[PDB]
């Protein structure tokens, strides 16, 4: 079981940004997909974003465009997430979890005298073991 | 006076148009074919002129040789040979004795008379 | 593509079987015939655990009292001989179309 | 006294022989503009004054289906066509899978299902970028994959096409005698394919002969001098094509009433490809006009000629085509730079017994072509913009005679014989290549002067 | 008593005609190395005694700009060039977009941006694998698609690059008329391009001419025997090119001061491609040097010869190029197997009236379009090390600005971007005529009666 | 002497170099140089052969110098024969009679050689 | 006695010269069946009875290995191979990564690992579809991608194409014929040294047929030695020169590829048919060859007898297998039935010779991709051939090398080597020399020309 | 009776087989290209020899008397010794080093002069 470390609970003022940190032992980010999920008490889970294990692709839920950026250290031993513009309704439990995906050619074209034109896509297989999570809340 | 007009006359009368007959003897697919055709024409003319030179009547449209031809090939009087048959059909008649005629006309007369012309020029 | 879950809550008499259902706007089968569905149960104060996956088999270590059914846009999770330790909130997972989302959820509690 | 032989040189010989025909062109009149496949932009020009020479008192033998300038020119044409196609760019990537739909609206009710609109996943000239392009396709050119469609020839040899500016219009050609060799022609107005000809003549160099390609009807052929000639290797044998040659022309009009446009496509770096853009105006089926009364009187003359080899009470029947490969089912021609396939069954639905003004035929367009009977090559017809219109002379027919016909009655015929060797025989039947052997021998009174 | 016409044979005859010229090279000296682009595998060796004889009492009509051997030259050289280009590798794979950077390595401040570090995900030997490879490129060979660069010649004919073993150094080529034809040359050192030549000689084969490729001034050419000469078939027509031929050479150096490093990568099986490797040391501009005082004394001599065709006290001025395609805009030539371009504007900045060295910056291009053709394109292989070039200037090609009034203040400009006039500069002395040994004449004989 | 040595010599003086002029009347592989050289050899062969054919037809073959017996109507020239020999080159000669050449070819062939083979046939009749 | 020279033409002159050979075949006998590489589409037919003519009172020299017909004809076959392989398709797509398995079904235990069943991800003729395709391959033609993944052995070399299977590789006799104005000098001496004059000479307009046999250690289907087994080299003292040996009497060798091959057809692209070997029927058996033993002793003993003439004839003479290196010279190769074989002749050279049951079997290897000739700029894939291959051939000569460092004129040793095809072609063409006839000439005489 | 048969006969006996040797002096595949090359080569050399024969004026002759004397520095054998005991082959070896001189002498000293003298004789 790869140990996962998350940032502690934090209270932040309305209309201001918040950042969290995340860790995994063994530098397993190179082999597992980085993921983020938010959930409030009594409400269903909400996907925030992902990095591929290669660190070559990033993505976000359409609700969080322009408010979330995802960074990692050299060697991808840790991953970081920054949130911007939190209000009182952004209070929830924020989670780390590794992931695994399927990489398949979505379209292709053989080339006799050149490289095969290829369109590749990532298809997440399942959500791996979750981290203990982080709690962030907004109050005056 | 047209080209190949003598075939319409007897073979005896055909000898008038000999000069007329001798006059016209001389990177795309068409270009390659043109090259091949020109080479073939040159080869054919030069092979014929090789015959003429070897037998010493070269440069002559008319030549009388010393070899006697041998009557079994065509037992006919010269006059009706000349005034009845065209050269086309008489050649058709004389068609398989051609190589024998070539060999005799080569060896029996030309090379020999040449040896005796050197012998005469010795004195 | 959207996901809904029913019932919102299900009181259960102990020892009696119960079922939960979730439906989606598009059929969950794949052109290869594969189905990408997973049901999860979270105990309050604990993270969710996989119960059934791909709408065909139970996850390893899941009690055999659990079962599932459904196809196309309709799927169900049926549990036999309800015991008090299954109380929590349940969710079914959709794995065919990006973005992948959880259903609104159903909660099972002991009737009183 | 006894005669001796003498050497005669220059004496005119006729020997049956074959050599390669020398290309020729009429003073290179076309050389002002580019480009022509049948002219290669140039051949060796010829003077306008070759002089045919009559051979009085001369007869000589001809043998059609045994003369060899025909197949010599046949391989000449195959070579020239391949040479013209070679510099052009291949169209191999085109048969990536196509999503297609039927053409709708602004159509003639008789067009339904003829044209299809398809799209591509096909890439850009940059190997790392893709695009979506579309073009209008004929139904006959494409086939379903199992709606989705694929180009029909990507389970045979590949398809190549470029060089659209090069014209397919035919040019007069002279197959002009090599030196030491001659060309002779029969002067008889009516002459069998074989046998001696009572009056003959020679030329230094041949007449203009067109390289036209036609399947069921002879086009731009020379007129028969007096009467509609019927020729074949053997009339009794049904495996031999029957040649029909007109002594009077029969005008035929053809057109593509559709106003067409073209879209240039870049597939590779510097390789332009052309596709058929959306047609302007209503769609109308291509069709051909011929005169009704002229066709009837011409076929009456034809059946009168047919009666010569048969019993005078034999019923002459003409029939719908036999089927098979489309290139022998339908009449085909290329005029205007584009290929056609027309229903000639209307022209041959009639029978003949002893003792408004025009005709129109539905016709077909195919842009994917397998020329001659080759399998290893294929090409694409470039779109041509606007309405094309061609007028041409129908000058002969290529017929086959059905088997059976027991008890010598009710002879029937159907079009066939897709071999263009027969067309080129139909034009070149006048000529024979012969060998001049200037040297010769003869007896004489010459005995060689001493010294 | 009356005369009768005789027939003669062997009488020397001349008819203004054209045939294909022989190939001839000096003793097949190129055969020792494999091989020159023009000399190739084989050609006929020269005669050890290319004998020529001055023709007593003969003046002959010569016509420069009308001889067709120069067109044969143009066609034959294009044919040889494509012949050598043909058994080589296409580089259609290179049209893939390249991620590029503005790299410097102790660069001088006047080249910042002239070189780009471009990489692309490329091709492997195996179809199912890809790899990332970088190489250094000149900015003028690439273009922004809308930084990412694409090489400039992918929206034109395809590019091919291989076969570095062939040599681009000119070799003198001698030409011999076909038997039954002869070569005529003018012995007048001051001869015009056209007109009668008072002193003439004939030769079995012409002298050697190197297939020099130049666009603004002549190189490696023959010197004028006595004085600088200016030729043009009609000086009044300003759209026509003006020939300038020096009688004294003008030495010119050109170099690329840095070493070059090379790397090679495989497009696929048998697909060797050479790429410019990373370049070490201070990075400096290719440039050419010419002496100042000589550049006057030859230009002043040119002006003195120039005044012959115009009225006295006519003002004469030179200026920098009016623009156009870069080939005519800048002076281009190949040395060390590599193509050059230089801003020759500095050496025309002068005026002339009645009564120690110059340094010129230069530019490098690798994707090159031969002559004016657009249907072919190639990549120049990198040339290792510092290229050093010593060469002679033997003439210039000029154009005359039109207009003006009162026949004064003439201004000239480089031009004539056709190398046709480059080979004319050497070929102008020669013509080939047809000999028919036959002849006729009256005489006093009659053939003996037999 | 070298080739074309008699170009400026008089017509009579040009007859000394006829042999000199005649000495040179005849003097991957797919490379275009080889193509051109093959073409050139073929062309030279053809021209030499045509010249020899014409000479053989006129019957003075094997001779740099011969003399036919054919007359000509003197409108083709304007001067004394010794003048022809002395005061111009062959080049001005040729320009002067450049336009009766085909007539001269035809007359030399027919008016003499055909008639002469006729008398030699008459002679061979014995 | 004031003699004058006189011109003679047609006089007999030789001049050492080299010109292009003239292709020839007896009445184009290859036309009976299509299609053959070495006979090509067409060649000039020749008379079945060339007129050989004995030159009496004649001696002349044949400097062997200085003759240029060999190099000219070497270039001819290189060109002919290239032109036969130009029209047919290229095979760059094959060496995508291969998933291979470990053939153990119906296999003889002496051969485990010779054949691999590999699968890969090449596409169809459709530009946007792929297909899973499998085929068996000999281990000699493949390598592991890493230290398993497999790749074709020659992709990091030059390009690879398929020999399109319609045209056979069987040799046909080729006649070399003199251009006009030339003749072909031929020796008559029955023991004629490779260099030096030949006591009796004949010439022919046109030569007999020679099969373009491709072999590496043994001379095959060659002309037999006229009287005795005989040995030639440029200089026997220089061991860098190959040692040519010609057999007096032939030694028959049987070779078969004993297994049923099956073949399958795969579409690569439009108009691109590909062939690969399908599953083999029956137990798999190594291909091999058969040769007699006492006859092998007999030929080798005769070789020793003739070798003793160039040495002190009490010396020890020993053979051993090749010193190694590239298999093209380490192993013997032949192409019978249109397929490539490499056979371990090491057993043929396990013997010693001193002063004063009936058969031998040899294992053979199989390869499909070939680096033909000594070129490295091309690689070609031979078609799989269905059924059991069978060849019967004549062994007519040897090519040997002699080890250096020999001292005191004793213990002379030899190994097979010199695999350059030029040596076989010398061994076949050694009887001929192209020469120039210069018919013109002069000589003194008493004739003075008649006065003009 | 065979081709080249004089190779072992003396210069004197060589003259019988001159005709036998002169009989065969003239008589997109790479093979066909080489065929074309060989045909051209044979044609051009045959024309070479015939051009030499014609310029010297023995056209139609394999043997032909001359007016050209020679310096005896070129050969030092009695005429019977060279003709009746020497092969024409070894004689060609012997005479190989003056052939250009004999060609020039033959071509100009006698032929051009004798053609001019034939003209002079014809004039009257
Ligand atoms: C488009 O036109 C084609 C024919 O041009 C129609 O093809 C028909 O397809 C159905 C279903 O596969 C078949 O049952 C018919 O036999 C086909 N017709 C013919 C003539 O073959 C097709 O239905 C048309 N599509 C639309 C949307 O109109
Ligand atoms: C030719 O005749 C004219 C007129 O009689 C004479 O004046 C002239 O001198 C003659 N020509 C020569 C060269 O003597
Ligand atoms: C295949 O067989 C060879 C020996 O025949 C052996 O070295 C190799 O390990 C085998 N591979 C497998 C996967 O068993
Ligand atoms: C090999 O050769 C000799 C004679 O050639 C023979 O006697 C000897 O026994 C042979 N060796 C074997 C193993 O038979």
Numbering used by the authors:
A (entry chain J): 1 to 52, 52A, 52B, 52C, 53 to 65, 68 to 82, 82A, 82B, ...
B (entry chain F): 520 to 545, 568 to 664
C (entry chain N): 2 to 27, 27A, 27B, 27C, 27D, 27E, 28 to 108
D (entry chain C): 32 to 141, 150 to 185, 189 to 309, 312 to 321, 321A, 322 to 398, 411 to 506
E (entry chain A): 32 to 141, 150 to 185, 189 to 309, 312 to 321, 321A, 322 to 398, 412 to 506
F (entry chain B): 520 to 546, 566 to 664
G (entry chain D): 32 to 141, 150 to 185, 185A, 189 to 309, 312 to 321, 321A, 322 to 398, 411 to 506
H (entry chain E): 520 to 546, 568 to 664
What did the published study say regarding this structure?
The HIV-1 envelope glycoprotein (Env) mediates essential processes of receptor binding and membrane fusion to initiate infection of a host cell. The apex of the HIV-1 Env trimer is composed of V1 and V2 loops layered on top of the V3 loop. From structures of antibody Fabs bound to the well-characterized clade A BG505 SOSIP trimer, it has been recognized that the epitope for bnAbs such as PGT145, PG9/16, and others bind to a quaternary epitope involving a basic residue charge “sink” as well as the conserved N160 glycan from more than one gp120 subunit15–17. We also report cryo-EM reconstructions of the apex-targeting PGT145 bnAb bound to two divergent Env that exhibit different degrees of structural dynamics throughout the trimer structures.
We thus applied HDX-MS and single particle cryo-EM analysis to examine the bnAb Fab engaging with a highly dynamic Env trimer, from isolate BJOX2000 and a highly ordered trimer, from isolate CNE55. The cryo-EM structures, reconstructed without symmetry imposed, were calculated to a global resolution of 4.87 Å for the BJOX2000 + PGT145 Fab complex and 5.14 Å for the CNE55 + PGT145 complex according to the 0.143 FSC gold standard criterion. CNE55, on the other hand, appears more conformationally uniform, exhibiting only unimodal spectra. In CNE55, a far more ordered trimer, where one might anticipate the assembly behaves in a unitary, cooperative fashion, the antibody binding likewise had only a local, targeted effect. Due to the limited resolution of the CNE55 complex, we could not confidently make similar comparisons with its structure. Clear density was observed for the N160 glycan in both the BJOX2000 and CNE55 complex maps, with glycan densities in the BJOX2000 + PGT145 Fab complex being more defined due to better local resolution at the Env-Fab interface. Notably, in both maps, N160 glycan density from all three gp120 subunits in a given Env trimer can be seen interacting with the Fab. In the case of CNE55 + PGT145, there is no clear connecting density between N156 glycan and Fab at high threshold, however at lower contour levels of the density map, Fab residues appear to be close enough for possible interactions. As the cryo-EM structures demonstrate, for both the dynamically inert CNE55 trimer as well as the more dynamic BJOX2000 trimer, PGT145 was able to engage N160 from all three protomers, as well as to insert its HCDR3 loop deep into the apex to reach the basic residue sink. The sites of interaction between the Fab and Env regions are similar between BJOX2000 and CNE55 confirming that the Fab binds its target epitope on Env in a conserved manner that is even more dependent on glycan contacts from all three subunits than had been previously appreciated.
